[PDB]
Amino acid sequence: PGAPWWKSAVFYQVYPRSFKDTNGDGIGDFKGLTEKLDYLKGLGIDAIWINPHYASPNTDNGYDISDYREVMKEYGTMEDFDRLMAELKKRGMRLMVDVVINHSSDQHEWFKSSRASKDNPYRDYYFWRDGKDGHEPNNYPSFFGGSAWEKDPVTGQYYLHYFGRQQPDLNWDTPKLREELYAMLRFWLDKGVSGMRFDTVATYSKTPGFPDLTPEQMKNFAEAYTQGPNLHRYLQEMHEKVFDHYDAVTAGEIFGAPLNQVPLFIDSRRKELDMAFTFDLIRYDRALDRWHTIPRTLADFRQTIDKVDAIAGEYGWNTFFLGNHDNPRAVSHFGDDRPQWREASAKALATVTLTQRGTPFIFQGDELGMTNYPFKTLQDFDDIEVKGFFQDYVETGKATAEELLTNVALTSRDNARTPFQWDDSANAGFTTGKPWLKVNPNYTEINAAREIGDPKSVYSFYRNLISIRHETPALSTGSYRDIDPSNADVYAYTRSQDGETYLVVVNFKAEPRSFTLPDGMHIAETLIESSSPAAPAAGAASLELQPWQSGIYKVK
Numbered sequence: 001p002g003a004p005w006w007k008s009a010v011f012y013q014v015y016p017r018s019f020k021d022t023n024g025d026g027i028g029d030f031k032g033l034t035e036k037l038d039y040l041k042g043l044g045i046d047a048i049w050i051n052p053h054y055a056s057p058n059t060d061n062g063y064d065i066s067d068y069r070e071v072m073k074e075y076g077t078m079e080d081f082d083r084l085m086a087e088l089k090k091r092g093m094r095l096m097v098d099v100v101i102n103h104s105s106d107q108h109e110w111f112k113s114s115r116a117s118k119d120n121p122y123r124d125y126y127f128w129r130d131g132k133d134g135h136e137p138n139n140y141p142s143f144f145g146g147s148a149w150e151k152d153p154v155t156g157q158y159y160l161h162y163f164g165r166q167q168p169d170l171n172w173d174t175p176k177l178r179e180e181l182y183a184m185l186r187f188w189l190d191k192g193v194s195g196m197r198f199d200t201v202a203t204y205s206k207t208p209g210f211p212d213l214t215p216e217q218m219k220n221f222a223e224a225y226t227q228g229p230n231l232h233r234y235l236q237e238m239h240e241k242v243f244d245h246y247d248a249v250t251a252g253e254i255f256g257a258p259l260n261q262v263p264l265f266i267d268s269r270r271k272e273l274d275m276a277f278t279f280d281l282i283r284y285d286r287a288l289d290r291w292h293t294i295p296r297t298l299a300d301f302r303q304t305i306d307k308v309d310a311i312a313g314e315y316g317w318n319t320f321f322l323g324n325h326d327n328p329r330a331v332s333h334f335g336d337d338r339p340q341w342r343e344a345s346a347k348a349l350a351t352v353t354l355t356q357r358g359t360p361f362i363f364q365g366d367e368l369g370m371t372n373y374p375f376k377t378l379q380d381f382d383d384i385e386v387k388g389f390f391q392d393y394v395e396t397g398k399a400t401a402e403e404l405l406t407n408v409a410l411t412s413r414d415n416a417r418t419p420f421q422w423d424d425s426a427n428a429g430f431t432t433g434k435p436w437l438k439v440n441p442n443y444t445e446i447n448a449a450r451e452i453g454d455p456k457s458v459y460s461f462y463r464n465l466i467s468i469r470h471e472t473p474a475l476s477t478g479s480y481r482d483i484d485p486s487n488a489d490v491y492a493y494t495r496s497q498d499g500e501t502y503l504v505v506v507n508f509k510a511e512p513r514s515f516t517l518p519d520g521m522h523i524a525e526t527l528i529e530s531s532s533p534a535a536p537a538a539g540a541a542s543l544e545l546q547p548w549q550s551g552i553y554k555v556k
C-alpha cells in the first residue's frame, strides 16, 4: 500500500492570539497568520494546527466557545478565515482546527436557554443536578479552581464544569446534543478543513449517578474523568456519522487517561481517531498538582517516549512534540536556556523532534529558540489556571503566594503564550500596539529576522532538519529502537525501513561524552550535526561528542 499523508507530514502549531497582530489591538489575528504563510512554507511546514478560532468570551483563550459557527471577533471575520484557507491551498498546505466539544462557553445560546428553567428543551444539553447535604452534588474538583459544580439561583440546581466555571460541560448522553455537534463538524468540514483535533476527548462520557470520587481517585481526579462508560461508543458514533464521509485526519487530545487506554482511541481498526496527543512526555516531570516539578533525567525522558511509541502498535499512530500552548518552552523545559547553551540545546532538541517516530508538531517560536518568560509577580500571569492555583492553594493556606510564583513560573502555560518574536523592532514586531501579554525581553537577540539569513541559526537548523526528514522515509514511518533505555547522558536510537537504517545520537549533557555504536554497526554517512567540529569517519564504530551535540547518521 502507501501511508497517509499525515504520517509523513511536519506540522506547526499556531496560537493565533500570540502569533501576529495586524491591527494594533495587541492580539494576534488571521490576517497576521495569512501574512506569514510564506514564512512557514519557507520553513518547510506541510500543515498547521491552529488553536480555537471560534466566537469566545476568552475566559480560556478560545476554549470557551459561545458560537461554533462564527469566527472569534479578535481574529477577524469568516471572510478572513476563508482567505486564510485559500492562501494555504495556494501553497499546497493543510489546515487542522481545534474542536472543543467536551464543554461550551456559558455564553453559548444553548446554555442561556438551558439554564432559564428546569423544563426547556435544552435542559439536558448540560448536566444539572441537585446538591446534597446542603453542599454540591458530589466531591468533583475543577481543574481551574474549587468545585466542578456551580449553583444557579434561577433553578436551585448545580451545573457541571470540569474546567472553568464559565465552561459548562456538554451532555453527550443526549442524542439531540450529539446530533447538533455532528452538524456543527460538517459545517467546518464542508468548508474544506483537512484535520480536526479534539480538546480533552477522553472526558466526554460522564459517570452515571455522579457518585463521589474515592479518596484514592481524588488524588488523580483527572483519570476518573476519563472513565465514562460510553466514551468509545460515542467516539465511534461520531466517526461513523461524520468522518466516515470525509477525508480529514482526526487527532485526539487524550488528557488524564492512562497510557494503556490510548490504543482504544487510535487503533485504525476501531474507527475512532487517527492520531494521539498524550501528556506523558511533556508532563513527565510534573507533579500531580500540576504546578510543581519533580527532578527527572534523560533515562526517564527516553523510557516514557519508549512506552508511548510502543502503545501505538501496528495500527496506531502518535504525534510528537516538545512544546505547545499548555506548557513551558521546550528549550527551557528539556534543554538548557542559559545564554551559553540555549542555541546548542535548542538545536539538539530539534534533532530529537524531527527524528521521532510519529507526526511532529513544532510549536511557534521553538524554531527560534524562545524561552520561558521572567515572571516577577502573580499579576504577570494572564492564565485562568494560575488564578485557580491561588484559589486552591494560597487562599486555603496550603502555600504562600511566593511559593506559588516560584514554582508556577517554571510550569505555567503563559511561558508559551508570550508574543512570537519576529524581529527587534518594538514588541519584537508582533504588534504596533500593546501586546496582550508582555514580550520576552530576550527578543533583542532571539528573533526570526536575525536567524533567517544566518545559516548557523536555530531556525536554519530546523529548516535543514525538516528538509532531511522529508527526504528520508525511515525518519517518518520507519521503525524505532532505543539503543539504551537506561542511559542518562546520551540519547541514541535507530529508525529503519526497507533495509535502510539511521542512527540518531544526542548528547543531553553540557559536557563532552562518548558513544559506542551497537556491536556490528558502523557509520556510513553523516547527514547532519549540531555543535560538532568534525563528522565521524566512514566506518566509525564510536563517536566523540561535544556538550549538547546532536547528529543523524546513516549506518551500515
Ligand SMILES: O[C@H]1[C@H](O)[C@@H](O)CN2CC[C@H](O)[C@H]12
Binding pocket: 060, 063, 100, 163, 199, 200, 253, 255, 326
Ligand atoms: O488548553 C486546555 C483548555 O484550557 C481546556 O479546554 C481543556 N483542554 C484539555 C486540557 C488541554 O490542555 C486543554
Ligand SMILES: [Ca+2]
Binding pocket: 020, 021, 022, 023, 024, 025, 026, 027, 028, 029, 074
Ligand atoms: Ca489583532
